[PDB]
Amino acid sequence: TYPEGSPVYHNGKLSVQGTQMVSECGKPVQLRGMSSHGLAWFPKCYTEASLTALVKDWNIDIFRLAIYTHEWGGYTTNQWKSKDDYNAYIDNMVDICAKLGIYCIIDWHVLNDGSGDPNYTLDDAIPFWDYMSAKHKDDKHVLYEICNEPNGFDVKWADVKEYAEAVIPVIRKNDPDKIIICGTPTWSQDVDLAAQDPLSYDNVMYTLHFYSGTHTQYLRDKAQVAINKGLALFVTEFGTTQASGDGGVYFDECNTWMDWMDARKISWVNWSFADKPESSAALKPGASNSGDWNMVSESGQYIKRKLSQPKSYESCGGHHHHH
């Protein structure tokens, strides 16, 4: 039972129709929300209290759990939690999102230390995704992001497609209808190359990542090629900075990206909800010590203001029933 008036109450189980993500009543939906930073790095930032503030005060529709596979404390490392205990932690966060009625992305966050080819994480990715899809089959509010940012010159769409064709059957044997979001080459830029040979599965979307200090028209044009060839795109990560996550903020270029996404009804998730002293972090340093989840940085202020706009969906109605 999702809480009255919440994003999941309004839209129910989402699916993909052509290039558009739609609600349980078949209406186009654009979701807006926030990504975690590394969970092992900022655990004080990801609690019932902090997510309650994100929902009630920042008006988010969706939260993304960035589960690093590598670097210190990554899922594959057994440096912070055992793999099965990390699963239990993730499950707790998924349940908090359910209690608040927001969507939750489980993100297998490949990036560095060789994980740039997601195939090189399969010894852990297969049992991870087997577990998560079995555990969360009956959870209407989860989305499965199977490989954050494939990268490397050696990592082509053919290689990412082979990874996806290994993991998606493992998910779909347990959870037939849940949306799967598939990363693309060159740090989830090459959606136009994925569009040349798309996956044959239903309810699949393709990842686009941008950073407004780095990516401009060229990447929007690549994305438009993918859209014109019939792919549904999801911006599961973007920043207001250059791609490193620090330095200047570029709000004029981000406004261009926001207008562009709005016109195409493309969902977006901002990097990051954390109080690291870098300019892409949405909280001021020390906010996790004080517990003041509205003590925003310059970037957080800008994103919270975008989140405060009218919802980019229309309720499925039937408010006279519990959902």
Rounded Cα–Cα distance for residues 1 and 23 (Å): 17
Distances (CA, A) of 68 to 37, 83, 234, 264: 9, 12, 19, 30
Helix axes 217-228, 251-264, angle to 10 degrees: 10
* Method used to solve the structure: X-ray
This structure's resolution (angstroms)?
1.6
Q: Which is the catalytic residue, given 237, 253, 278, 298?
A: 237
318: left (phi over 0), alpha (psi -120 to 50) or beta: left
Q: Catalytic residue among 4, 48, 149, 314, which?
A: 149
Q: Where do breaks (C to N over 2.5 Å) occur in the chain, by preceding residue number?
A: none
CB 166 within 8 A of CB 129: no
> Which domain CATH number covers 116?
3.20.20.80
Going by the DSSP 8-state scheme, the letter that residue 45 receives in this structure is G
- Residue spans of alpha helices (H) in the chain: 7-11, 48-56, 83-100, 122-135, 157-172, 185-188, 191-194, 217-228, 251-264, 287-290, 298-307
Is 71 among the residues known to form the active site? no
- Give the pairing of strands 180-182 and 20-22: unpaired
Exposed, middle or buried: residue 218 (CB in 10 Å: 0-12, 13-18, 19+)?
exposed
Residue in the structure block whose two tokens are 């670097």: 71
Cβ atoms of 145 and 236 closer than 8 Å: yes
As a whole number of angstroms, the distance between CA 30 and CA 22 comes to 9
* Number of domains observed in the structure of the chain: 1
The whole domain housing 116 covers 1-323
**CA end-to-end span of the chain:** 6
> What is the Cα–Cα distance from 188 to 180, expressed in whole angstroms?
15
- Give the H or E element holding residue 21: strand 20-22
How many Å apart are CA 89 and CA 81, to the nearest integer? 9
149 is catalytic: yes
